[PDB]
Amino acid sequence: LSDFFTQLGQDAQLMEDYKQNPEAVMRAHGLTDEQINAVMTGDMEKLKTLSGD
Amino acid sequence: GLSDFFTQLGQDAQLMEDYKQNPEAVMRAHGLTDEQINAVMTGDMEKLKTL
Amino acid sequence: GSLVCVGTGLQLAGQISVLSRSYIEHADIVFSLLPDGFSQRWLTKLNPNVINLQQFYAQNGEVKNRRDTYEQMVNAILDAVRAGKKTVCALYGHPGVFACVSHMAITRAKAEGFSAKMEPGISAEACLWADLGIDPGNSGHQSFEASQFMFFNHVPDPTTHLLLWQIAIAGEHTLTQFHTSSDRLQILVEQLNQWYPLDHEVVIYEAANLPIQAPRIERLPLANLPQAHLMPISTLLIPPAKKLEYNYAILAKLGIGPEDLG
Amino acid sequence: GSLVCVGTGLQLAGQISVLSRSYIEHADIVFSLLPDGFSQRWLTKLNPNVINLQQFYAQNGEVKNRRDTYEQMVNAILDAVRAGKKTVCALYGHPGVFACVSHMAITRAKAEGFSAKMEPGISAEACLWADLGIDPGNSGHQSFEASQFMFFNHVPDPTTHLLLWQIAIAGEHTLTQFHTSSDRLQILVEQLNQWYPLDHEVVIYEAANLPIQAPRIERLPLANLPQAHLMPISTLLIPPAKKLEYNYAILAKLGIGPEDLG
Ligand SMILES: C[S@@+](CC[C@H](N)C(=O)[O-])C[C@H]1O[C@@H](n2cnc3c(N)ncnc32)[C@H](O)[C@@H]1O
Ligand SMILES: Nc1ncnc2c1ncn2[C@@H]1O[C@H](CSCC[C@H](N)C(=O)O)[C@@H](O)[C@H]1O
Ligand SMILES: [Zn+2]
Missing domain, CATH: 3.30.950.10 (Tetrapyrrole methylase, C-terminal domain)
Known part of the structure; x- marks a missing residue:
């Protein structure tokens, strides 16, 4: 999750891929349904829980 | 020669710190001419954009 | 010993400048104040020698003036500089925009005869x-x-x-x-x-x-x-509560008017 | 086609964002407005497909409203977007700070149903x-x-x-x-x-x-x-012509005085 976000923020190619198809890209990086749900609902608090912070 | 140096220097903090320690030494080592170095030391950008 | 204060921007990983990232990489030690644990992890992978300034904030319901917090941050940064470490301070956004810690550390460092500077960052x-x-x-x-x-x-x-x-x-x-x-x-x-x-x-x-x-x-x-x-x-x-009004006094001195505004 | 306006900062090469640099690197085409020839070469090596917006400025001591210049800049940017190019606009500093070309191009792109965004940069x-x-x-x-x-x-x-x-x-x-x-x-x-x-x-x-x-x-x-x-x-x-003075009106409403300030 943390690895994904670091890449996504740095890499414009991945960023553009992501904005095209967020769920597809996220699943491709192995994010869980719970993690994806949190992203799609914009629940940042939950995201930080699903990494251990 | 000049353009390549500046691009590196602006991007690379190691080289930046090296340069600030000893500007002339670093510049000479990157093959800058005496006139180019003079230009830098006098702060004449216009002449740099000529050289 | 030297000091360079950089900003990491607001967004994770990508909003820091190329030069500023490089400073973090090559630092002996880094003092951080970042928005979250994702940004913290990113930092640690860039340079493992990190001290998190968060620790200096009021801990455990304690009453503490935030000025005292800042002082302790500043002092912690200077300790590394005085010891002779090539020190980097990494704050989120722009390190000198509504942020006193960096300005204070730079002022104090300069006065003790240390090299200190601030690199601009992307602010809120x-x-x-x-x-x-x-x-x-x-x-x-x-x-x-x-x-x-x-x-x-x-x-x-x-x-x-x-x-x-x-x-x-x-x-x-x-x-x-x-x-x-x-x-x-x-x-x-x-x-x-x-x-x-x-x-x-x-x-x-x-x-x-x-x-x-x-x-x-x-x-x-x-x-x-x-x-x-x-x-x-x-x-x-x-946002503005009023539309601009013409400054007839000055326009007249300039010898122009509204319709003359190209 | 899409549009991303980025800033390159003031300093050569080092002051652009990590992400913003990546945008330039992967762009189909780049429209540039940079401070000097050193910055121009840097850009061209990053991505060779560059169109210099400078060209749209008056060339032969001719009288030309800079509003006409900006319009031609905007139209040139939009032409690439309409053609289907993944277009990046690279302006010095912050692209949206005292710079209408980007805001105008983004507004126009959005209205014609194109993806367009602005990435913040380091301004003067x-x-x-x-x-x-x-x-x-x-x-x-x-x-x-x-x-x-x-x-x-x-x-x-x-x-x-x-x-x-x-x-x-x-x-x-x-x-x-x-x-x-x-x-x-x-x-x-x-x-x-x-x-x-x-x-x-x-x-x-x-x-x-x-x-x-x-x-x-x-x-x-x-x-x-x-x-x-x-x-x-x-x-x-x-710089300030006067030092900060106490706002006794509001302090009174807050039920405090200067001495209560932390
Ligand atoms: C101590 S200042 C830090 C500012 C930071 N150095 C910068 O460059 O924005 C904290 C204030 O900055 C602003 N700020 C910080 N993070 C922000 C964000 N993500 N979005 C908007 N404003 C923010 C808010 O006004 C907040 O109260
Ligand atoms: N190198 C520089 N140093 C100081 N101010 C500068 C500058 N370059 C541009 N400016 C300021 O910007 C004005 C041009 S408008 C361009 C601003 C640019 N987008 C930015 O982000 O700064 C100049 O008239 C001046 O006020
Ligand atoms: Zn401002």
Whole structure:
């Protein structure tokens, strides 16, 4: 999750891929349904829980 | 020669710190001419954009 | 020993400048103040020798003046410099925008004969222009710390975009709390009513810290501010309340007029 | 086709964002507006498919409203987007700070149903805070375009740090000339004299564009401004004319006094 976000923020190619198809890209990086749900609902608090912070 | 140096220097903090320690030494080592170095030391950008 | 203060921007990993990242890489030691644990991990992978300045904030319900926190941060940074470490301070956004720690560390370092400098970063202000599609040059802009706006005499230009930073602690005079009260915010509304009507649309803005996160751009009437849900990271945008009026005096001296404005 | 406007900062190569650089690198085509030829070469090596927006500026001492220039810039950018190119616009500093080309291109792209966004960058303002060791939050901050300050009614707060951008063309209404005159600047001094004594120290600031270059930080009394050597990249800093004074009105409503301030 943390690895994904670091890449996504740095890499414009991945960023553009992501904005095209967020769920597809996220699943491709192995994010869980719970993690994806949190992203799609914009629940940042939950995201930080699903990494251990 | 000049353009390549500046691009590196602006991007690379190691080289930046090296340069600030000893500007002339670093510049000479990157093959800058005496006139180019003079230009830098006098702060004449216009002449740099000529050289 | 030397000191370089850099900013990491608001967004994770990608909003830091190329040079500034390089400084972090090559540092002997890094003192960090970052928005979250994702940004913290990113930092540690860049350079493992990190000391987190967060530790100096009030811990465990303790009452502590935030000035004392800053002093301890500054002193901790200088300790590494005095020991002879090539030290880097990494703060979120721009290290010298509404942030005293870096300015203080640089001043103190210089006075003890150490090399110290600040590299500019991308601030919340910078993010705001981009997110809201506003150019600060259009009608100009003004920035004030919300509390300072209340405690001291400041007069805004109501034709310009006004920003009040740290709106969440507006009127929190002790500097020991992390939020203010709705009554303090009501007094701020009354104060602002000098230039802005109660139904004037304002915007609570929060730049995103994560690449999967949308910014907060919440529009509401000024009157509703006291009931709003504010965060430490919230900035209040107050758009112009008036259209520009011609400066006939100066135009005349210039020998021009409205229709002559090309 | 899509549009992303990025900023390259003021300094060569190092002051662009990590993400913003990546955008340039992966762009189909890049439209550039950069400070110098060193910056231009840097760009071309990053991505060879570059169109220089400079070309749209008057070439042969011809009279041309800069509003016509901006229009041609915008249309050229949109043409690439309409054709289906993943287009990036690279402007110096922050792309949305005192720069209409990007805002205009983004507005137009969005209206024709294209994806368009602006990435924030490091502006001349951001550089100034760092170079001068000034925090805009210390006593607040105001920014205005010099000419707009003269043409319209802006009231500055003399406790703040005041910036006048594009000071070199202060009062130049036609927007055709590349500089103003000493008489125009004298009128500005008289205007400013409403709030600032004639012997008030102001600062002509120019951030460096090259890593071997020191910034211009030229101090002089306000009255000497009209004789100063100003350049297009010059920004005028007007530090506070007065120290912060207590706002007893609001303090009273808060039920506190100066001595209660943390
Ligand atoms: C101590 S200042 C830090 C500012 C930071 N140095 C910068 O460059 O924005 C904290 C204040 O900055 C603003 N701020 C910080 N993070 C923000 C964000 N993500 N979005 C909007 N404003 C933010 C708010 O006004 C907040 O109260
Ligand atoms: N190197 C420099 N140093 C100081 N101010 C500068 C500058 N380059 C541009 N400016 C300011 O910007 C004005 C041009 S408008 C371009 C602003 C640019 N987008 C930015 O982000 O800064 C100049 O008239 C001056 O006020
Ligand atoms: Zn500003």
